[PDB]
Amino acid sequence: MNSVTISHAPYTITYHDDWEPVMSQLVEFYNEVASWLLRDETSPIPDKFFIQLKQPLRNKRVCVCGIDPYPKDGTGVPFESPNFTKKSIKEIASSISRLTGVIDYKGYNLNIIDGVIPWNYYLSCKLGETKSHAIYWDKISKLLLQHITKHVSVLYCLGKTDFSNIRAKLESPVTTIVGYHPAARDHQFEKDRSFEIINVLLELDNKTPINWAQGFIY
Amino acid sequence: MDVRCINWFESHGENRFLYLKSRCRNGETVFIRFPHYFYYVVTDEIYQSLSPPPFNARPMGKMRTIDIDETISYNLDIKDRKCSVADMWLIEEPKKRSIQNATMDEFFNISWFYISNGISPDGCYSLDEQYLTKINNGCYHCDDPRNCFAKEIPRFDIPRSYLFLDIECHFDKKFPSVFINPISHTSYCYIDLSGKRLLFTLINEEMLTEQEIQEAVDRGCLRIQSLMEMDYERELVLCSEIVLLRIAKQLLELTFDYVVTFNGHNFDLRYITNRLELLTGEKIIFRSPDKKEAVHLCIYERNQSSHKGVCGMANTTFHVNNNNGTIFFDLYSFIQKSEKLDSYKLDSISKNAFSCMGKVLNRGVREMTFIGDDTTDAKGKADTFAKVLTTGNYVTVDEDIICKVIRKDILENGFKVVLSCPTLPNDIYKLSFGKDDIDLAQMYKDYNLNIALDMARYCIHDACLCQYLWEYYGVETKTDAGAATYVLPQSMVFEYRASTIIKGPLLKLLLETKTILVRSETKQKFPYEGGKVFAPKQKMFSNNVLIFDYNSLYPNVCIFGNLSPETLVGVVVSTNRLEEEINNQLLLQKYPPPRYITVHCEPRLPNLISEIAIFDRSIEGTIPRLLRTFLAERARYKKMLKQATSSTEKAIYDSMQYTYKIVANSVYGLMGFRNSALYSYASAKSCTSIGRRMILYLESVLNGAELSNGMLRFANTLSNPFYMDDRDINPIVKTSLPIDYRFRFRSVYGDTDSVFTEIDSQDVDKSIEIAKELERLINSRVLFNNFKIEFEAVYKNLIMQSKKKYTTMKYSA
Amino acid sequence: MTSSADLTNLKELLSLYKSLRFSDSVAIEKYNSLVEWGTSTYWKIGVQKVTNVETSISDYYDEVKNKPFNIDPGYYIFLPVYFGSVFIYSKGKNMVELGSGNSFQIPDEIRSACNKVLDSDNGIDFLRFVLLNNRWIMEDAISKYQSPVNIFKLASEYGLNIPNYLEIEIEEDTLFDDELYSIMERSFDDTFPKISISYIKLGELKRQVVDFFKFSFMYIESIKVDRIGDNIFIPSVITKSGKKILVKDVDHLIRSKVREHTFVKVKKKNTFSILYDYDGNGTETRGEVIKRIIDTIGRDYYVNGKYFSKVGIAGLKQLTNKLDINECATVDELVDEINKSGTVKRKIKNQSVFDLSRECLGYPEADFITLVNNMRFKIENCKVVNFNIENTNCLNNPSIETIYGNFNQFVSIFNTVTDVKKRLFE
């Protein structure tokens, strides 16, 4: 556990030693963009921006990347807000509950999973519209993805429209599984029937397949 | 209505549309809309077996399909290559489809749009008013572009509206940041449709104190607060950053023919748009001429990390998305990718662009004047250097003497410049117009009015440098010629690669010859090596060396040998010597040298020792026809240029011949590209083998010969390495040369297309005369069919250190 | 993708990733291609080189026992394991050899019986082949769907020799001593020698091998040649102790690297003989061994396969011998006989004259073409007339020397076959 202090609203940053090599860089990359970012109300609080940076990365081998946090109700963990009303958590639960064979789903809580971490291309957004702060972390979205892809062997992303140029965005040709958004990639509903592909690909790398029922809460 | 085209572009919306930008004689810009299409080719049965009714069907006509799959054979029982003849049709579909047996999947859809409709990208057309439908003022829609372009007229010069802009932004680190640093100055050279070339620099007044702003206003600067107060006839205009960025946005929203900048895509436009979004939350709204769609300034990178050779990797090219039809031209990428330089910096290009030999009038300790009249210089460079010097203030005397111009004046066929340079003994010096060399941070720490004006002058000089390079390289004329030849959009003439460059003329040739090449099996690539430079006989030479080269060696050998994949009868491979000789004795009676030709290629497989490619020279192939047509067209345009007097026609013809030269000197390189439509392993191997054979023949005929009593006796007889000819074979030849001449020829070095021959003669004039006589003899008797050579220069004291590494003195003809 | 590959890998990539038992020479191309363009199968990115793999069937055998031990009680199927060449086969698979990649195809009837048996039950992973004395004898039947005895009886129903089978139930810790080995050997008594006796428990994939050594050194004699004219024999080695030495192939003889008529000790058995395999040290040139074996077998003989047929009596009879037709002595009669046999006529045309002649004389595909390469020819009417060598670097081994000596007979056969082809295809 390490703590760092900055000159802006977030101040303390929550992260782990696994993310440590880039954190300082992120700090400077957040020094010159926080002034023009905190001026507009955001879905998470400034402290909540760095929340998903503390989970361990060595144990996890598959990373699931989403499109963007929804404009309100910031929580710091993608597709995590338990309400059974918003499409995000319901889709992130039903994309694996039906495949595994379990029913009566109310939330999966990917935080406790030691092999799969949820992710988003953009850290946050503005209260009222999406992708309203993409410029301020356009290179943070590069360095975070570079750091996470160096700790895992399989990368999963949702939505081809916003993830078409991931290969150009990546430097090391690490294996990257491409998938569609559970709600709608582009005016098209996706059931996300590619999790068994992720399991078999992880098995091919001499690694145990992901148990998608370890954190199923019912 | 007469329209000359400027650019072609297509929309990126859900309902994709293609647009054409042109201008009339008066200067009114005309935009025309066409429906974007997807082009596919089908046969008779496939067209007749389409359950949905086709949107539009056009009979492509009779065409012959040939399989280009290599069939390696170990004996002379080689089956005939697959070939068929059938009627084909072309179909246009707005949306993407997946149709089986639809060939020609490599040619771009824009190339099909250009070629099927018979439209030249840079042509001037007298459109018909009956087939044109008007949308609104300046923007029309056409449903039948085939009938729209039914008339073409000879080209006429139009004053193109240009924007040559440069932007100097504040910076404390190596590269300025959008979120940290503001825009300081923006210099624009704006050429209207009326020809008024207005130079104006907008400055950010928020970095100057109120007294400084008042003093600048007293000095002539205009201070404004709103966009309605902007005046374009004043060089120095002071305004706030919000006002400056709004003015820049309203300028970039204008329908300019060419917005030309140096490294603008990477730095200038990106910084402008990002600062506009950050400071005010506004976006540069690019609007389509139809006023049906709008976008923002997005810069996307096309990355090409592939060389297919031994060198390193190239760079990526940035492009701006828009629908206003304005070419956001970047000269940096064009210069980098079309010219070799030691350093890819603006200073180097500026230094190597304009040079002038001038005479020192006075010395005055550190006060020298360099008069640049035509007496001390060449012809033509005087006016151009005067135009460059009008907007410049720094001179690179000698090679590193940076000096600042004190006074400026203009003289007829010359110029007047005075510099602070130390006294020198020599009278004539070569001055190169280098970029300004200043320590920006040190002089920015004490920023004031004079420093602001100096930066404004530097910015306007940088902005006008774009116009100077645009005129020097003939980029308008070269771009029009490249659009006409390569069959590509004017913005995509330089942006696209060699494969797309060829795909236009290659498709045109294929349509002319009704030829389709189809490859079914997956292609396999093998190292074909390629090279002949060997160890020189000697490295020390105190005598002159004569240089002789081949004029378009590879195109000519492809034409002569008919080195085409669809003409290749077959390949015979040998593993044992007995079957090799049996096959040789069979092919010398089945494939006679007088009609066919056999080329000894390198074995494609490790087990094989000898591979023989048999080319039938009865039907000319697509590659030889391409090269022959390109050479003929270049020669025709060159001989038309030689009789031209007007500068405009001179530039036009030079650009057209340059484009033909470029498109001719690419087919050999593209024969080694797997994904290209000219891919052929056997043809490339045969081409390099024939080149090596020609180099060997030239070396043999030029080594061991002697000149005595006007008679030349070659060491080896005039024997054709390929087949048997019917002409004189005696190496002894007579020349009209002095009897006292006693010289010996001994070649020591030979490149892929050049051979170095040493001559013991020391006189320059005698060496030049001997080289000319040798060239005439080689072109008259030694060579045959359609082969020629040329004389470039004479090398003196040629000493070789290693392969392709020599030091010598070159004397012009 | 769900359509194909990846999660299925077509059941080749996933198997070859970890299982090295099924590593035949046919699948190397597919595996190398799939791994090389792993970024081009459907999607994703991946590159690696998996070239030069070999059949590692030994994973099915845990370890080999050289001393008596204690066997666990249970139900055991006892079979005799013979000595000779080892092969694998699985549902029309190419007949590949372990360690050399030999592709000597089995006859049609045995292949038909094997594929019919495998179609009867799909649980048979693979079956071993033995080529002792140029004969095909069943070795093992690894399967889990049904007992190996049913597979053996089904194979024997078609008319194929199968090894004897026994079933033993033991409910105590019986010691596996030499008496048990002797009685099991007596139970599987046959004219065909066997190298050991194997026991299989409940069809376990992993298996144990038990054997003993009884080597002795008395004397060694010259290598006998069993050339009888039927092209079915082996280069047996005769000793002075009253027993011969079993040799599976000439490759084993040339790999033994043991001197002749000297103090030689080789692996003897209780009632059989196993040729010694060179695994120690010592100084011995290959050329001397090749000469001392070629002079014993014969000057006109050489080293390849198991035939090394004579050349001096070739004439036209060897053409009939290699075409399994009746004897003949005249060109026109031989041509008519070839035309009469439709299968022979069809199978002649797909092979070149040079290849047919080199198979008729049995010229190896290792050095014959190499010697032909570095030598000049003068050819008239597509028949060899003159030949001359220029370098002796390829003449170091006696095999090239004797091939050059018989090159006259080779040219005669080449001319004869060329004339036959010309008269048959004109």
Short mmCIF file of all heavy atoms in Angstrom, two decimals, chain B residues 75 575-582 585-586 609, chain C residues 352 354 369 372-373 375-377 379 382 384 414:
data_model
loop_
_atom_site.label_atom_id
_atom_site.label_comp_id
_atom_site.label_asym_id
_atom_site.label_seq_id
_atom_site.Cartn_x
_atom_site.Cartn_y
_atom_site.Cartn_z
N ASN B 75 9.84 -32.29 -65.49
CA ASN B 75 10.08 -32.82 -66.83
C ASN B 75 9.33 -31.95 -67.83
O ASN B 75 8.55 -31.07 -67.47
CB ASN B 75 9.65 -34.28 -66.94
CG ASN B 75 8.29 -34.54 -66.32
OD1 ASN B 75 7.65 -33.63 -65.81
ND2 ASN B 75 7.85 -35.79 -66.36
N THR B 575 16.86 -31.88 -60.12
CA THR B 575 17.51 -32.41 -58.93
C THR B 575 18.74 -33.24 -59.26
O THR B 575 19.70 -33.24 -58.50
CB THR B 575 16.52 -33.27 -58.13
OG1 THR B 575 15.31 -32.53 -57.91
CG2 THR B 575 17.11 -33.65 -56.78
N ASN B 576 18.73 -33.93 -60.40
CA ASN B 576 19.86 -34.71 -60.89
C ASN B 576 20.34 -34.15 -62.21
O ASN B 576 19.58 -33.56 -62.98
CB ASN B 576 19.48 -36.19 -61.05
CG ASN B 576 18.16 -36.38 -61.75
OD1 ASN B 576 17.47 -35.41 -62.06
ND2 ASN B 576 17.81 -37.63 -62.02
N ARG B 577 21.63 -34.34 -62.48
CA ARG B 577 22.23 -33.81 -63.70
C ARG B 577 21.73 -34.53 -64.95
O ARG B 577 21.58 -33.90 -66.00
CB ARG B 577 23.76 -33.90 -63.62
CG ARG B 577 24.48 -33.20 -64.76
CD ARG B 577 24.15 -31.72 -64.80
NE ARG B 577 24.27 -31.09 -63.49
CZ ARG B 577 25.41 -30.74 -62.92
NH1 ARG B 577 26.57 -30.94 -63.53
NH2 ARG B 577 25.40 -30.17 -61.72
N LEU B 578 21.47 -35.83 -64.85
CA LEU B 578 21.05 -36.60 -66.02
C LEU B 578 19.70 -36.11 -66.54
O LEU B 578 19.54 -35.84 -67.73
CB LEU B 578 21.00 -38.09 -65.68
CG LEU B 578 20.60 -39.01 -66.83
CD1 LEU B 578 21.58 -38.85 -67.98
CD2 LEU B 578 20.53 -40.45 -66.37
N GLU B 579 18.71 -36.00 -65.65
CA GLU B 579 17.42 -35.46 -66.05
C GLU B 579 17.54 -34.00 -66.46
O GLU B 579 16.80 -33.55 -67.34
CB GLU B 579 16.40 -35.60 -64.93
CG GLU B 579 15.94 -37.02 -64.67
CD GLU B 579 14.94 -37.09 -63.54
OE1 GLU B 579 14.75 -36.07 -62.84
OE2 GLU B 579 14.33 -38.16 -63.35
N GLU B 580 18.46 -33.25 -65.85
CA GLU B 580 18.67 -31.87 -66.25
C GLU B 580 19.10 -31.78 -67.71
O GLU B 580 18.56 -30.99 -68.49
CB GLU B 580 19.71 -31.22 -65.34
CG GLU B 580 20.23 -29.88 -65.85
CD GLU B 580 21.30 -29.29 -64.95
OE1 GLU B 580 21.53 -29.86 -63.86
OE2 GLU B 580 21.90 -28.27 -65.33
N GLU B 581 20.07 -32.61 -68.11
CA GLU B 581 20.55 -32.57 -69.48
C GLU B 581 19.54 -33.16 -70.46
O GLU B 581 19.43 -32.69 -71.59
CB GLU B 581 21.89 -33.28 -69.60
CG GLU B 581 22.64 -32.97 -70.88
CD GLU B 581 24.12 -33.27 -70.78
OE1 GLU B 581 24.57 -33.73 -69.71
OE2 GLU B 581 24.84 -33.05 -71.78
N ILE B 582 18.79 -34.19 -70.04
CA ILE B 582 17.71 -34.70 -70.88
C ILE B 582 16.67 -33.61 -71.13
O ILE B 582 16.20 -33.42 -72.25
CB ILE B 582 17.09 -35.96 -70.26
CG1 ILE B 582 18.06 -37.13 -70.32
CG2 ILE B 582 15.79 -36.32 -70.97
CD1 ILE B 582 17.74 -38.25 -69.36
N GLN B 585 18.09 -31.04 -73.59
CA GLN B 585 18.04 -31.51 -74.97
C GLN B 585 16.61 -31.59 -75.49
O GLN B 585 16.39 -31.48 -76.70
CB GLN B 585 18.73 -32.87 -75.09
CG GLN B 585 20.23 -32.82 -74.83
CD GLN B 585 20.99 -33.88 -75.59
OE1 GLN B 585 20.46 -34.51 -76.51
NE2 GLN B 585 22.25 -34.10 -75.21
N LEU B 586 15.64 -31.79 -74.60
CA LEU B 586 14.24 -31.77 -75.01
C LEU B 586 13.75 -30.36 -75.29
O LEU B 586 13.02 -30.13 -76.26
CB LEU B 586 13.37 -32.44 -73.95
CG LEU B 586 13.18 -33.95 -74.06
CD1 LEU B 586 12.79 -34.54 -72.72
CD2 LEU B 586 12.15 -34.28 -75.12
N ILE B 609 18.91 -27.78 -58.02
CA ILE B 609 20.15 -27.09 -58.36
C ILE B 609 20.00 -26.15 -59.55
O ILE B 609 20.77 -25.18 -59.64
CB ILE B 609 21.30 -28.09 -58.62
CG1 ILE B 609 20.98 -28.98 -59.82
CG2 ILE B 609 21.56 -28.94 -57.38
CD1 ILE B 609 22.14 -29.81 -60.30
N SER C 352 8.27 -41.71 -63.39
CA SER C 352 9.20 -41.40 -64.46
C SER C 352 10.08 -42.61 -64.77
O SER C 352 10.19 -43.55 -63.98
CB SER C 352 10.08 -40.20 -64.08
OG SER C 352 11.10 -40.58 -63.18
N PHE C 354 13.36 -42.64 -65.03
CA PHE C 354 14.48 -42.65 -64.09
C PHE C 354 14.06 -43.22 -62.74
O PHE C 354 14.76 -44.05 -62.16
CB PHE C 354 15.04 -41.24 -63.93
CG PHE C 354 16.11 -41.12 -62.87
CD1 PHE C 354 17.43 -41.41 -63.16
CD2 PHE C 354 15.79 -40.70 -61.59
CE1 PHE C 354 18.41 -41.29 -62.20
CE2 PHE C 354 16.76 -40.58 -60.62
CZ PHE C 354 18.07 -40.88 -60.93
N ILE C 369 21.17 -39.84 -56.74
CA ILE C 369 21.01 -38.56 -57.43
C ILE C 369 22.15 -37.61 -57.07
O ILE C 369 22.57 -36.81 -57.90
CB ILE C 369 19.63 -37.97 -57.14
CG1 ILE C 369 18.55 -38.79 -57.85
CG2 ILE C 369 19.55 -36.50 -57.52
CD1 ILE C 369 17.14 -38.40 -57.48
N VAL C 372 24.85 -38.63 -59.35
CA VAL C 372 24.50 -38.24 -60.71
C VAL C 372 24.71 -36.74 -60.91
O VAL C 372 25.08 -36.29 -62.00
CB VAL C 372 23.05 -38.67 -61.02
CG1 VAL C 372 22.53 -37.98 -62.27
CG2 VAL C 372 22.98 -40.17 -61.19
N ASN C 373 24.49 -35.94 -59.86
CA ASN C 373 24.58 -34.49 -59.98
C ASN C 373 25.99 -34.05 -60.35
O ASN C 373 26.19 -33.30 -61.31
CB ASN C 373 24.13 -33.83 -58.68
CG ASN C 373 22.71 -33.33 -58.75
OD1 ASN C 373 22.25 -32.89 -59.80
ND2 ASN C 373 22.00 -33.39 -57.63
N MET C 375 28.48 -35.17 -61.97
CA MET C 375 29.09 -35.95 -63.04
C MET C 375 28.41 -35.57 -64.35
O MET C 375 27.20 -35.33 -64.38
CB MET C 375 28.99 -37.45 -62.77
CG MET C 375 27.60 -38.04 -62.90
SD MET C 375 27.58 -39.83 -62.72
CE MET C 375 28.57 -40.32 -64.13
N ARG C 376 29.19 -35.51 -65.42
CA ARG C 376 28.72 -35.03 -66.71
C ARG C 376 28.27 -36.19 -67.59
O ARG C 376 28.82 -37.30 -67.53
CB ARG C 376 29.82 -34.24 -67.42
CG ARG C 376 29.33 -33.41 -68.61
CD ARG C 376 28.04 -32.69 -68.28
NE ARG C 376 28.26 -31.50 -67.46
CZ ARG C 376 27.37 -30.52 -67.30
NH1 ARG C 376 26.18 -30.57 -67.88
NH2 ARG C 376 27.68 -29.48 -66.54
N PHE C 377 27.27 -35.92 -68.42
CA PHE C 377 26.65 -36.92 -69.28
C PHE C 377 26.65 -36.44 -70.72
O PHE C 377 26.59 -35.24 -71.00
CB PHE C 377 25.21 -37.22 -68.85
CG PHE C 377 25.09 -37.81 -67.48
CD1 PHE C 377 25.03 -36.99 -66.36
CD2 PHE C 377 25.05 -39.18 -67.30
CE1 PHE C 377 24.92 -37.53 -65.10
CE2 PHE C 377 24.95 -39.72 -66.03
CZ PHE C 377 24.88 -38.90 -64.93
N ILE C 379 24.30 -37.51 -73.94
CA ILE C 379 23.04 -38.22 -74.13
C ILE C 379 22.65 -38.12 -75.60
O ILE C 379 22.69 -37.03 -76.18
CB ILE C 379 21.93 -37.64 -73.23
CG1 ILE C 379 22.39 -37.62 -71.77
CG2 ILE C 379 20.64 -38.43 -73.39
CD1 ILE C 379 21.60 -36.68 -70.91
N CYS C 382 17.77 -39.28 -75.99
CA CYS C 382 17.24 -39.40 -74.63
C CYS C 382 17.67 -40.71 -73.96
O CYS C 382 16.97 -41.23 -73.08
CB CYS C 382 15.72 -39.26 -74.60
SG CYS C 382 15.12 -37.68 -75.26
N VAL C 384 21.31 -42.56 -72.23
CA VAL C 384 22.67 -42.26 -71.80
C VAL C 384 23.65 -42.97 -72.72
O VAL C 384 23.53 -44.17 -72.99
CB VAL C 384 22.87 -42.68 -70.34
CG1 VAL C 384 24.25 -42.25 -69.85
CG2 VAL C 384 21.78 -42.11 -69.47
N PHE C 414 17.97 -48.26 -67.85
CA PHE C 414 17.35 -46.98 -68.19
C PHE C 414 16.97 -46.95 -69.67
O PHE C 414 15.86 -46.53 -70.03
CB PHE C 414 18.30 -45.84 -67.85
CG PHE C 414 17.77 -44.47 -68.18
CD1 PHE C 414 16.43 -44.17 -68.03
CD2 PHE C 414 18.62 -43.48 -68.62
CE1 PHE C 414 15.94 -42.91 -68.34
CE2 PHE C 414 18.15 -42.22 -68.93
CZ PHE C 414 16.81 -41.93 -68.79
#
